[PDB]
């Protein structure tokens, strides 16, 4: 169980790093799919089967429309990759790299300072998540439905051609 979690975590880290430092949009989307598959594998190793199930179910459709928009605008041959290459320079990425590194080491210092007892890996079924979702957490569900409705209304209002 440790092996699957650690291999999926390493794959997720590598695929995210390849995502943020790539010029090809379709290859970046493929590595993003790989990273989210690895994230769902991490979820499955921790016993949260529903979390990994929703990570593959709803993000396969999310990156699908990302592919649709990439085909819609970004694909132009080598010109788009060449234009994306000029925006990335050694100073340009070395600027915020040390900021991300110092933030990461501060958060790691924070993480290591807490007590630990180990994750037992006991599976949590979708039945318990459904009971808690429609039980103690009513208003989260209802106002999340209203939030998604609001986002849908915003998408309709902005995304019209004419």
């Amino acid at each position: 169980m440790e092996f699957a979690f650690y291999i999926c975590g390493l794959i997720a880290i590598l695929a995210t790093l390849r995502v943020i430092t790539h010029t090809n949009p379709v290859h970046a989307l493929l590595y993003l799919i790989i990273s989210l598959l690895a994230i769902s594998g991490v979820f499955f190793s921790l016993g949260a089967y529903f979390a990994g199930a929703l990570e593959i179910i709803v993000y396969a459709g999310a990156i699908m429309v990302l592919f649709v928009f990439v085909v819609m605008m970004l694909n132009l041959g080598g010109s788009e990759i060449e234009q994306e290459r000029q925006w990335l320079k050694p100073q340009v990425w070395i600027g915020p790299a040390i900021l991300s590194a110092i933030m990461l080491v501060v958060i790691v210092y924070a993480i290591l300072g807490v007590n630990d007892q180990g994750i037992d890996g006991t599976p949590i079924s979708a039945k318990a998540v459904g009971i808690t979702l429609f039980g103690p957490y009513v208003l989260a569900v209802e106002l999340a439905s209203m939030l998604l409705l609001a986002g849908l209304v915003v998408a309709f209002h902005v995304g019209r051609e004419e």
């Binding site: 440790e2 979690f5 997720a12 995502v19 994230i39 529903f50 999310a62 605008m73 957490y137 995304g159």
Partner: protein, 100 residues
């Protein structure tokens, strides 16, 4: 049996990688991709937090996190389509006429 610290460190690494892709990348689509990476990393940290305590609260917070992720992705995708329609490029540094 699996340490909580390693899962939180993994989530932190993914979060700072998403922020690196948010800052250093100039095309708006990669900023939205990096935003998706941070929201997935925060959701992942919530699932590790819920799995350490053996509660469904982390999974419910993950559900809310990805509902927000989907809604913000649709809104940002519509805004990016508007930007590409009325500018014909996805340079985010040209959005600077409002200053001072």
């Amino acid at each position: 049996m699996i340490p909580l610290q390693h899962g939180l460190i993994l989530a932190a690494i993914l979060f700072v990688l998403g922020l690196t892709g948010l800052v250093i990348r100039r095309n708006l689509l990669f900023m939205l991709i990096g935003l998706e990476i941070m929201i997935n990393a925060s959701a992942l940290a919530f699932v590790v937090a819920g799995s350490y305590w053996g509660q469904t609260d982390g999974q419910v917070m993950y559900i809310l996190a990805i509902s927000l992720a989907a809604a913000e992705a649709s809104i940002g995708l519509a805004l990016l389509l508007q930007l590409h329609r009325r500018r014909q490029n996805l340079n985010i540094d040209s959005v600077s006429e409002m200053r001072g």
